[PDB]
Design an enzyme around this catalytic site. Structure first.
Site, short mmCIF file in Angstrom:
data_model
loop_
_atom_site.label_atom_id
_atom_site.label_comp_id
_atom_site.label_asym_id
_atom_site.label_seq_id
_atom_site.Cartn_x
_atom_site.Cartn_y
_atom_site.Cartn_z
CG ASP A 1 -11.35 8.14 7.54
OD1 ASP A 1 -12.48 7.69 7.30
OD2 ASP A 1 -10.55 8.44 6.63
CE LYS B 1 -3.50 2.46 2.69
NZ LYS B 1 -2.59 3.33 3.49
#
Lengths: 317, 178, 142, 54
Positions: free
Chosen positions: B96, B5
């Site tokens: 988040d 990632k």
């Protein structure tokens, strides 16, 4: 068949006259200059603007009256609603209430180019909006303060003249060093209160005014750009549209343009007069609903200070 | 298996702050995706980290995302509630939370933690609860009530002080115009 | 390919350090060959934390910034040992230190797992080997 | 007092609608044909705006 629209949700009192063909028979606004309330400015200004509107076109010509029901302040919505009701009764013509944010979106769509994922950023209202599944929903929004509101507060603290949008823009045009401030992006939301507080602290630290202003604008516009990207991925919108007063900033405009080019999408901003709070948008939206049978009565024209874009019904699309 | 990632350098933003934020988010994601397993929460393993390249290589999980099947299988709402109440009890404030930060193959892992933060502020926990509520409402408004109820049931199951922050949540929900 | 061996009952002797290109670890504390492979990868690619790459391997295996503490946690002791080196040197070290070669001394049993968990303060849910890999990787922080 | 009755009737028909959109009043107020001072000033502003719209 034409309409006369009033915008009074905020400090801007806007009177417009708009035709069904799409043209604008007339438009004008007055931005309330804080030293009273926005409601007092609306009460004292709508008479003059409406007199000018009759001067441009005979009062018997306007077939509809529309007013910004909301969202917005309480007293301002009260004054615009009562003025619109008085106009409708005196002319014996229909009165309609319109959603002010939806008016922004719709005027932007009419005066530029279709279904633009609309970043509505203003001095008291910031949120990303999009028309999905037969309704205009907020796909992201502030949590404490509005981007324009945060910039304006920063301006007052640093004594920047009101408004500070174009002023902060010009001060950031010559910025290179970036101060460290929190970058709060919760999902599709922002908390500009943290940014404003951090900018307050940085200014209290003796930082270069240009550097801190550049940093704040970069932070804020970057989070707005990122939530716009997230909402574009969520909605697959074909074009971003920056609206509201803060659209006056070329810094924000270029960040949004760079984003949209990176995402193979187009970014739009309509004329300067239409970006701000104008009466033309209210007239256009009211006549848009009237064209498809939005019949409103006197009893149905109360103010909705927290009018949500999800509280509206749309047929004009 | 394993997946890599990267926090690409979005061109539209300032290169300086862009790199700064990418580095900070990579560091926070690594630290909190690791610290999360201290509380029994399934998560991908951090096999290798690269701050300079902003590349983190972690175990790959073969499971449908929570947002993909949460509505179809409401129990995932309870599991999310459990693995969020674990966070809040441990004060790891995920800032988040969404229904896309979780994978379900056999157990519900928490995939992303980029914006996480350690804080003992119940107000922050209420804010993040509101964040998840808004996310789930926007994605699957058709099932907001049931999903929220099951998530809060899991929250109650794992977290005890929930009510306090939940009360706080209501107050934060009352931040509108008179 | 670097040579890693696990020797049982090795006779530790100080003057080996005098001979000097090798590293010795506690075979019981070190998890398995994955621990050594992660240590070597981190030492080679990532920024070394120690002046000497060879004992930088030991520092990487320890999983914390400090060195002398890495020595006392993972430094070798009498008996079982884990030797990391680059063939002839391996034979010489085997001949000098002594012991019996046993790959099983590096594998993980219940006692080895409890040793690892106690030493690394691994208080959580997850595989031991993956957790130590993660602990070493997280050395790049703070 | 008003210059005539028709103007008063129109002003009432225009403002009383806004009056009935606020249920909670600070104190009893007669509207027919420190908080109190400000509230009455608010209704006076409403009546003014209404008449000057014409």
């Amino acid at each position: 068949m034409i309409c006369l629209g009033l915008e009074g949700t905020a400090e801007k009192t806007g009177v417009g006259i708009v035709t069904s063909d799409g043209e604008v028979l007339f438009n004008k606004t007055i931005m309330y200059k804080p030293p009273r309330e926005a409601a007092d400015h609306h009460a004292e200004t709508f008479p003059k603007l409406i007199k000018e509107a009759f001067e441009v076109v005979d009062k018997n010509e306007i077939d509809l009256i529309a007013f910004s029901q909301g969202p917005g302040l309480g007293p301002s919505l009260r004054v615009t609603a009562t003025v619109a009701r008085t106009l409708s009764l005196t002319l014996k013509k229909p009165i309609i209430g319109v959603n002010h944010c939806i008016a922004h979106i719709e005027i932007g769509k009419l005066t530029t180019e279709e279904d633009p994922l609309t970043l509505y950023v203003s001095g008291g209202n910031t949120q990303v909006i999009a028309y999905v599944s037969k309704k205009y929903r907020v796909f992201g929004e502030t949590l404490d303060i509005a981007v324009g509101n945060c910039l304006d507060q920063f301006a007052r603290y640093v004594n920047l003249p009101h408004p500070g949008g174009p002023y902060i823009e010009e001060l950031a045009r010559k910025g290179k060093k970036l101060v460290d401030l929190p970058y709060t992006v919760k999902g599709m939301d922002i908390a500009f209160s943290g940014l404003l507080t951090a900018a307050m602290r940085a200014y209290d630290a003796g930082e270069r005014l240009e550097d801190i202003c550049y940093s704040l604008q970069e932070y804020a516009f970057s989070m707005l750009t990122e939530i716009t990207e997230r909402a574009l991925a969520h909605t697959n919108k074909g074009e971003v549209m920056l609206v509201g007063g803060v659209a006056a900033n070329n810094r924000l405009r270029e960040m949004l343009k760079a984003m949209c080019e990176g995402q193979n999408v187009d970014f739009y901003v309509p004329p300067k007069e239409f970006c701000g709070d104008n009466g033309a948008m209210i007239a256009w939206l009211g006549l848009l609903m009237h064209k498809n049978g939005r019949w409103m009565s006197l009893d149905e024209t109360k103010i909705i200070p927290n009018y949500r874009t999800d509280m509206v019904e749309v047929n004009w699309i | 298996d394993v997946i890599i990632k990267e926090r690409v350098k979005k061109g539209y933003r300032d290169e300086r702050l862009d790199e700064n934020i990418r580095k900070s988010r990579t560091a926070r994601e690594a630290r909190y995706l690791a610290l999360v397993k201290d509380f029994g929460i399934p998560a991908p393993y951090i096999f290798d980290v690269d701050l300079d390249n902003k590349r983190i290589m972690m175990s790959y999980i073969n499971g449908k995302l929570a947002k993909d099947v949460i509505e179809d299988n409401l129990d995932i709402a309870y599991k999310i509630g459990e693995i969020v109440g674990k966070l809040h009890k441990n004060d790891v404030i995920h800032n988040d939370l969404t229904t896309s930060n979780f994978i379900f193959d056999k157990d519900l892992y928490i995939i992303d933690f980029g914006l996480g933060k350690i804080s003992n502020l119940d107000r922050d926990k209420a804010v993040d609860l509101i964040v998840f509520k808004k996310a789930v409402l926007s994605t699957h408004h058709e099932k907001f009530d049931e999903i929220w109820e099951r998530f809060l049931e899991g929250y109650k199951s794992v977290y005890d002080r929930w009510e306090i922050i939940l009360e706080l949540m209501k107050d934060v929900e009352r931040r509108a115009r008179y | 390919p670097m040579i890693i061996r696990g020797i049982r009952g090795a006779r530790i002797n100080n003057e080996i350090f005098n001979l000097g290109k090798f590293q010795i670890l506690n075979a019981d504390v070190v998890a398995t060959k994955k621990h050594v492979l992660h240590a070597i990868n981190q030492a080679k690619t990532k920024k070394p934390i120690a002046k000497s790459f060879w004992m930088e391997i030991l520092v990487r295996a320890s999983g914390q910034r400090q060195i002398h503490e890495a020595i006392k946690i993972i430094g070798a002791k009498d008996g079982n040992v884990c030797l990391i080196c680059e063939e002839e040197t391996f034979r010489k070290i085997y001949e000098l230190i002594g012991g019996e070669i046993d790959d099983s001394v590096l594998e993980i049993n219940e006692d080895k797992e409890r040793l690892i968990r106690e030493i690394f303060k691994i208080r959580g849910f997850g595989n031991v080997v993956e957790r130590v890999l993660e602990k070493i990787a997280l050395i790049e922080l703070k | 007092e008003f210059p005539s009755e028709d103007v008063a009737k129109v002003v009432y028909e225009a403002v009383l609608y806004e009056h009935l959109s606020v249920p909670y009043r600070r104190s009893e107020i007669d509207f027919k044909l420190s908080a109190l001072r400000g509230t009455v000033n608010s209704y006076l502003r409403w009546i003014k705006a209404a008449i000057d719209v014409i």
